[PDB]
Design a protein around this ligand. Sequence first.
Ligand SMILES: CCCCCCCCCCCCCC(=O)O
Ligand SMILES: CCCCCCCCCCCCCC(=O)O
Lengths: 68, 68, 68, 281, 283, 235, 239, 234, 264
Amino acid sequence: GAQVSTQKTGAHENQNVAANGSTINYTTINYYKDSASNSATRQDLSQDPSKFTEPVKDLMLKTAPALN
Amino acid sequence: GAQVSTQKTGAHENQNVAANGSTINYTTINYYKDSASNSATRQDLSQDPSKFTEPVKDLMLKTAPALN
Amino acid sequence: GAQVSTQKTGAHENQNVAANGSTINYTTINYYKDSASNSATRQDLSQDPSKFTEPVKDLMLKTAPALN
Amino acid sequence: QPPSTQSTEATSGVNSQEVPALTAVETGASGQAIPSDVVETRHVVNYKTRSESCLESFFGRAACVTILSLTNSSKSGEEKKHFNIWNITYTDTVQLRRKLEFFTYSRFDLEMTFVFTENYPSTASGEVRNQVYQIMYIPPGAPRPSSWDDYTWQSSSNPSIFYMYGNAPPRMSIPYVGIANAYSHFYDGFARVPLEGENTDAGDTFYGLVSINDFGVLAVRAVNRSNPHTIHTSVRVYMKPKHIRCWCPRPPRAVLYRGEGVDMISSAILPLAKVDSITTF
Amino acid sequence: VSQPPSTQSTEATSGVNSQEVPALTAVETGASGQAIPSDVVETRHVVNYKTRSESCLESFFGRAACVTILSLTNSSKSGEEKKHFNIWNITYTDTVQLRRKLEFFTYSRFDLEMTFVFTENYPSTASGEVRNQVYQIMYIPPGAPRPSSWDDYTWQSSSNPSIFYMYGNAPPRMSIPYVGIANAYSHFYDGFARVPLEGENTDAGDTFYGLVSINDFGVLAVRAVNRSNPHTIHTSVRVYMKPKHIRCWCPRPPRAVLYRGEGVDMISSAILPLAKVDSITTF
Amino acid sequence: GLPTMNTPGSNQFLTSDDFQSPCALPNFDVTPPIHIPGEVKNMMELAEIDTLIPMNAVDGKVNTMEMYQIPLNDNLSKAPIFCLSLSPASDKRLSHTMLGEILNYYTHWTGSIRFTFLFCGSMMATGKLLLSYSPPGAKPPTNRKDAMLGTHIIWDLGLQSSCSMVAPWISNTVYRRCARDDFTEGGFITCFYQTRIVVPASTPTSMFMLGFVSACPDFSVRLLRDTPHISQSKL
Amino acid sequence: GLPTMNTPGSNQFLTSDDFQSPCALPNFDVTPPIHIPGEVKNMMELAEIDTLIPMNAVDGKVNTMEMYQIPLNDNLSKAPIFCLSLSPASDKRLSHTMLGEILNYYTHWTGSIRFTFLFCGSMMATGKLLLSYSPPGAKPPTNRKDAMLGTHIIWDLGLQSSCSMVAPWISNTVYRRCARDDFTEGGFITCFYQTRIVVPASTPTSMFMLGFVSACPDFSVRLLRDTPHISQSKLIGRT
Amino acid sequence: GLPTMNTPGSNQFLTSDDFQSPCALPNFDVTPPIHIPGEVKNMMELAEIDTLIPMNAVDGKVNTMEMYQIPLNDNLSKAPIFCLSLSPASDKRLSHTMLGEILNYYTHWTGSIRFTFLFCGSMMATGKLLLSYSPPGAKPPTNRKDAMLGTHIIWDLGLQSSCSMVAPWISNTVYRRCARDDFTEGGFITCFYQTRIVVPASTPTSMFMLGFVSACPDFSVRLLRDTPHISQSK
Amino acid sequence: YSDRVRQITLGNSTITTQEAANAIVAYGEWPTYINDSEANPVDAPTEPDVSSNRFYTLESVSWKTTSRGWWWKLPDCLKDMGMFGQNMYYHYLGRSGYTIHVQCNASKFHQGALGVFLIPEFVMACNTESKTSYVSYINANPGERGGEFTNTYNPSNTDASEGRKFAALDYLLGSGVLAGNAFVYPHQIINLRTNNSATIVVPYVNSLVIDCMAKHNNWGIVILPLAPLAFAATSSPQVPITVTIAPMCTEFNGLRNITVPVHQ
Ligand SMILES: CCCCCCCCCCCCCC(=O)O
Ligand SMILES: CCCCCCCCCCCCCC(=O)O
């Protein structure tokens, strides 16, 4: 019941696409009943900066004057 | 998610054709998230010495006078 | 990419191959890319003593006078 | 199947206007002649290969790159010897740097293995408990510990290895970490450009790759408190490049190295042996 | 998954009053006699399930043997510095039992397993505390530099292979691929490394003959890793080797007498290997 | 990561071990094989080759070339020419033969054993010999009459000079020991005349015979052991 | 839970080890590759480059630039102009060429070797040179007569300023040792004038030739070793 | 049972390890998650937030509120009125901003940096300022002329009370060290008056500007490291 | 269409010869502009075109029969060369490939040979012994004038003034590396017997796609008198050697106030 994922690239690896070669492949099995025992999660690169940098109720555009 | 490949031959092996017996195969699984943690890569034996031994814009044939 | 083959028989076997079902099978995996690292080969019981015991040009027959 | 070296084809006598044996070295090209062009040859079949000399194989072994010295001191002095901070480099070792220096540029992942060994250097031998060591990497820009018991050994970000003596030699993989796409073995330049208003004495270590090499330091300490009976521990650091590509090949140094760069010692300017004559075989 | 071959089975027979008499077979021809019981006596039919597995060459040569013993010493005394460094050529001159088995063949091709067994003792009357030792073994192929001492630069081993062993862990092991420059190792060499000529000395080559003159696979170097302790400690290193994946050519008889030296030299004191009996008719 | 348990037998060094290990010289390509004649695949192929039996190793004829020469004559005798214990491993003369030497690396053995005799007399010599094998556990062969209560061949000397007898595999056991003990009694092989050797006037009166021993095709060996014939000074 | 047995070789450090290991710096973002000119994939690609032979290693030439200059003259002499033992990683003259330096890291080697000669005399100069190679037996030639009884080429000096000779792979073995060894001795290379160099008025009577050596395409090496060509004082740990 | 070999690195503790381990509290019920507001997934989300630059580093304005207040006058001047060394992590003025502090946990960094300014003078006052970035390896921008040669914008004071200058990622290296590496010189950020501030009668003639620093969207960091800004007793 | 005759046309200047060896393209690669896929800076680039990609001549040197060689650094030589030189001081970053054409005329009665070698990252040793890697900016970068090699080593262990210089030994190539292996580097040889010129096309080579020319010399050039110059006359005639260089596919990034380096 192993899961697999793409390994992060290294010195002799392919381009940043990481799509070239089935050989880039880390395989893992969880051995414990509590998921707290599992290794760390997959990188989550999802980002949402607007929450902190642009939490404006009004719709603000960058080209529009900020004021008006 | 194992990789399977051919081993380098030894004393009791075939005609160094690796097309005689399946007993020359071996397996491996990557166990770490970064590819830098993997084993050394499969050897790329492609070579192109001409870039260092005959880097000449206007190609000479070896039997041609080098200089006409 | 494992190999599966039979075992040399032991005390509780009927000495026939596959007459002991799956009892006598074993699994072996090569873990190295270099065949020098492999464990010993399958016994090769093939042999031909005539190379040393009857190395003759004129075929000898057992019942013929050797010196025909 | 893997490629083999080329086979030689069978040949016979030749009488033609072809000149494979003649050339013009001046072009910068190497000669191209092979035995089949110059002498009668037989057909041979070459199953021999060149994997043994591929770059991954050439650079396929770990080498000792430095020696660190750690001491557990029961004396009022030498507390400072409980830890050792070394600049990370491979230039302390001549065999390894010479191999790497075959190329102007290189790109590789690196793995490190350490070997610990220790003795009891004093005449007053006695019981010492099994010791544990911490290998901490201190990245460039990170603070250095002032002491083996300095708070920076907390290692909240700095990665480290805790090794108990007697277990398998500790080991870790390091990814390529250059800020360039390739590591530079040589650098004909200066870290900073002196400008017109500056003093004409404008050397002061700015010249050479050394001045632009900051890969942090490796800080190793015993992790215990002093024991009445002291210990001298020698740590040998091993390095092996992995997944390596190189570019722009260059000839190796024939003389002993002087320091970090390519500086020469006057005592080793004459690397080759003499012979009795041109005509001695 | 198939039934392995067994040794020859026996058919039932009866006496034969005929002109076919295989019992009377010549050996003058170079052939061995081939008669089996069914040729000379009345026999019982017997099904044969016996297998010649231990006699296959892989099994015959399938066990590790001690090859040599090296003496390595760790001491604070300055006169002992040279004893922390031990150089040994690989040869099976040092081990009768293995040499003899290899000799059954003229040539052989195999991969070789090496295992190292280290044992510590105090060689003197000293017995205070010392620290656990680490040992380094590096192989130095012909032409590679040799260390001058136990503590030297060549120990960097950048291109030479090596093993670092912590005392008390499992004996270290490594596999060596076939390393001949021939298509088989020669067990014997009836020749000289070079041919003397053009009127040079007629005694030329007297000390440069036989397999030893062409046999050089490199040397094994073992060294203490630790700095010296006040209490001298000595380590005996037993080097074991086991050929595997082995093929051999051209049988030879085993040596019947006490070996002496590397080659086939006899020792004058022990050239009478056969025991005497009281009579040709003793039984 | 993966929970495991170290069982007994862990981290031990066994000389009969068959585990895999890292290559010290990884990716070394092996020098290509060539065909070499005389390939040996099994030690039995050598055990099956006729080798001389050092039968006359008596009174100074020991460790000399004459050691393999069995004397024969034209006199009257009812006595044996020679006698061998069958045990190929314990008989002092059979042990030091190719068969005995291969065999001495083993503890157990089984199968039939072939004994071949070559007469090296004059062409003008005639006569007949009685060669026999007497299974164990009874009065030994002694004279020429008791010796016929067993397997025998009558060898009529002629142009096909060489002949052989096979001491058939007769045992209570499946295998016999190579080691000497009282239980593993091999039985006996002896030879005596049917008739004296007869020659014409002015020809040799004495002759020699060469005996050979070899394994039969049904022969096998089992467990390996160190060979007692090899020795060395302490290292 | 899964029962296991540790084999011999367990918990040892092998410098030849190719086992996987934890990354000290997880999730590190590696600087992307770019194209860099001159990628080298195999060391043999450098072995195939023709480099100079420091043949003139006699006292006073040794360790200076003249070391690479093979003297030539218009004087008539049957004497050889040069001689080399064909032992590419042993001969004092060859062990430091690029081919020798690569081979100094190898224990065993094989395949043909090419020798290229460049004449640097004036355009006005002419003549003929005999290059010759013989297998490692009999005697080194000390006479053109014997040099002819072997593999040889006669080079017409002319507009094609250079020529080459290849010492074919003639050996009893598959691989020769790099280490000096009588058993594996590689043979002899010599050169004699076939025709003296002919010099017209106002042309110098002495000339130099530059000899070069390189690996041929069938060339290979077996086994890595450390080089006895670089050293250092013993390293002592910082304290 | 199953033959195995322990490799180098066995039985060691690495602080960077990512291995599974048995749970000390088996079958524990983890209090269910709720939609807690303000989730942060990445540190760069904080790097992009504009924070103030403690520019007024002159002794007496250090470690006080005035530290972030940059004085301006209507007095005619051709003097520089602002001098940053850019290195977000090593510049004494930037290392304590949030961007600088985040970078003090990293060894290397890349991407463009944005500098935003806010004029807090009277509504009545107007004028123009020159905001400029000059690449490294050059004489510092001694005067307005040099500032004009480099990358710059003119901020025309009006209703849009703020402006942003961007110092693009011009670097020979892909990444620069966070450390004070003379090799990876930051370059220079400066400011000159484009024109004297025009101040009508009966208003303040001395006013303040606030400056902010933040990461641009092409910004990133590499290896994690200990920050030198915190310490403790043993 | 013989190989001996060439015409090189870059920018607004043409170099021709009736005698040449076919040009070398180091590593088989021509200089190109940086592709979007491998760019570092975001600044729209300066592409001088003809303003930079034209030939400039370095001051000629004389080849004496006692010479041990000459050296130059490529981007350093062109530092004062018209617009190329100005762009170097105006921008932080810049990149260029090069075309190098070397000539040396001689009579049919002259003999000798000059190797022309291009060394990416040509790093020379400090001539001080004393403290390591002590080289001044001024002496490191001589301009089109270049510098030379000697056949003796005399590090100035007691004086920095001769120490700020390179230990330009000819037989160790200024680095400890034997000259006989100089041939590893892309090279062409001018053999006065036949060939009177050499041409080498030089790609940009670095670990970076672009770098600062004021800090780093990507390539150096060495001219080595591999075979001695000779002529029957005892006058031991000197012959000129002229090195002519054009940058190729030049681009610059990071426009800044113009700089001036520390001067002599
Ligand atoms: C946790 C340990 C991290 C160690 C990081 C440094 C890795 C090696 C850096 C490259 C060595 C210098 C190469 C060169 O000279 O171009
Ligand atoms: C890293 C250790 C390398 C060891 C290389 C030596 C291997 C054994 C060489 C062959 C010795 C002769 C064998 C034979 O007699 O059949």
